[PDB]
Write a protein that binds this DNA or RNA. Sequence first.
DNA 1: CCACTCACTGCGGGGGGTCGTAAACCACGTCTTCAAGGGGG
Length: 49
Amino acid sequence: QECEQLREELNETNSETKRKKLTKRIKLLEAFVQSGNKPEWMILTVLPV
DNA sequence: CCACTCACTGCGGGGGGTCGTAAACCACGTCTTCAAGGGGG
């Protein structure tokens, strides 16, 4: 849903800096979607030794 | 309104008193095999 909203307002917006920021954000979101990693795994609950 | 910096950041060259357990044994002992010797040049 975040990707959908970002795509819509990217198609809507006219400012170029917003376009660059949102294309970076969309790249990150699609990377998470395709890779399979979960976002919450960046917070550690088990620490290896 | 988005232009146009500029400050910013990151990158290379202290007392005592009890308790339980893997150490920590000195007696414990009887077993082994230490065996004195035995005969066939």
